[PDB]
Structure 1
Amino acid sequence: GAYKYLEELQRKKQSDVLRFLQRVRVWEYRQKNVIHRAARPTRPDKARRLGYKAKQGFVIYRVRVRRGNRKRPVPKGATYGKPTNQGVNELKYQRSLRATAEERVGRRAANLRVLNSYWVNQDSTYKYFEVILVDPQHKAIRRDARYNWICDPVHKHREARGLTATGKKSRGINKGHKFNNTKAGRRKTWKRQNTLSLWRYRK
């Protein structure tokens, strides 16, 4: 409906009308700070789809992140090991830019819990994502049983532990033979398979 016009239009991100807006918008975000409060979502369709509700306590942040690989921070490219570890310029930091931005806003609004995030614009040097936050101290969120699971401490800093949407996507956590290597957690999985399980009555 009224949001599917927003949804279906957004599929045509390369369309003539949107190319005007993104180019205008990427200029608008560039001039402002790296992290700044967003008065209202730029994509109210996407936010509601993703769980944002026009309620007091929901916080929206815009963040810009540098693009590209993670240059190995060894001094002057000296790695001091076998030649397979000499590679420095071509390391990929196997965790998404969406996660990297999501950490930074999570640190910025340290009192607060990251729900999810979605990108809004990009260029060659930067990526821009707009981040959804939920306020667990506002009584509107402690009440409202649809959302009071936020108020529990067990999900605090959901963003840093890889419990967010892109975190699960990056951790490789999904069902199938295609994910058997990392199903219950790669490190958790590794420990279980490399454990020598001994019973008192030896088999």
Structure 2
Amino acid sequence: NRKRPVPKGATYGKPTNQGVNELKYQRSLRATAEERVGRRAANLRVLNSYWVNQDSTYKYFEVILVDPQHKAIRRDARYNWICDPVHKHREARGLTATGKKSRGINKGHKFNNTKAGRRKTWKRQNTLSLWRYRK
């Protein structure tokens, strides 16, 4: 789990937020692995990753990275899409497979909260839409 980084377990609030120990990170270990690997090889673009091993203390993943400035990848038009700049730090934005899984981006009645983006959806249903001729 993710132990809350509070000194001596003090939260200074209601008990609900006073709980400290059994809190869980909302992103996956795959997600943080890809984020760390991308932060290391910032000149590369993270494509995907997979689980390879695990023990009691560690989970082991292998992440694929693409060189956006390698000439074959600039050519070889199957990968100019990742050469494009809108894909900078996909793993940081949560755009990878595990990132989208953690964000809950799926079609259906089970993902009404997070289907076009959780915060975008919440904003949409929390705006007060006023027209010129009030309806």
Give a deviation string over 1:92-137, Cα, whole Å, max 9, x none. 0111000011100000001110000001110000000001000011
CA distance, structure 1, for counterparts of residue 101 and residue 15 of structure 2: 31
Which is higher, the Rg of structure 1 or of structure 2? 1
Give a deviation string over 1:166-201, Cα, whole Å, max 9, x none. 000000000000111110000000000000000000
CA distance, structure 2, for counterparts of residue 170 and residue 179 of structure 1: 12
CA distance, structure 2, for counterparts of residue 82 and residue 180 of structure 1: 29
Give a deviation string over 1:59-118, Cα, whole Å, max 9, x none. xxxxxxxxxx00000110000000111111110011100001110000000111000000
Which consecutive residues of structure 1, in runs of 5 or more, have no partner in the other structure?
1-68
Which TM-score applies when normalising by structure 2? 0.99
Deviation of 1:138 after TM superposition, in Å, equals: 0.6
Could you tell me which residue of structure 1 aligns to residue 114 of structure 2?
182
Aligned counterpart in structure 2 of residue 192 of structure 1, from 124, 128, 133: 124
Identity of aligned residues (%): 100
Where in structure 1 do 4 or more consecutive aligned residues deviate above 6 Å? Answer: none
Could you tell me which residue of structure 1 aligns to residue 133 of structure 2?
201
Give a deviation string over 1:23-58, Cα, whole Å, max 9, x none. xxxxxxxxxxxxxxxxxxxxxxxxxxxxxxxxxxxx
CA distance, structure 1, for counterparts of residue 20 and residue 32 of structure 2: 20
Give a deviation string over 1:123-160, Cα, whole Å, max 9, x none. 00000000100001110000011111111001111110
CA distance, structure 1, for counterparts of residue 115 and residue 52 of structure 2: 31
**CA RMSD, aligned part only?**
0.5
Could you tell me which residue of structure 1 aligns to residue 89 of structure 2?
157
CA distance, structure 2, for counterparts of residue 135 and residue 102 of structure 1: 15
CA distance, structure 2, for counterparts of residue 166 and residue 87 of structure 1: 28
CA distance, structure 2, for counterparts of residue 182 and residue 148 of structure 1: 29
> How many equivalent pairs are there?
135
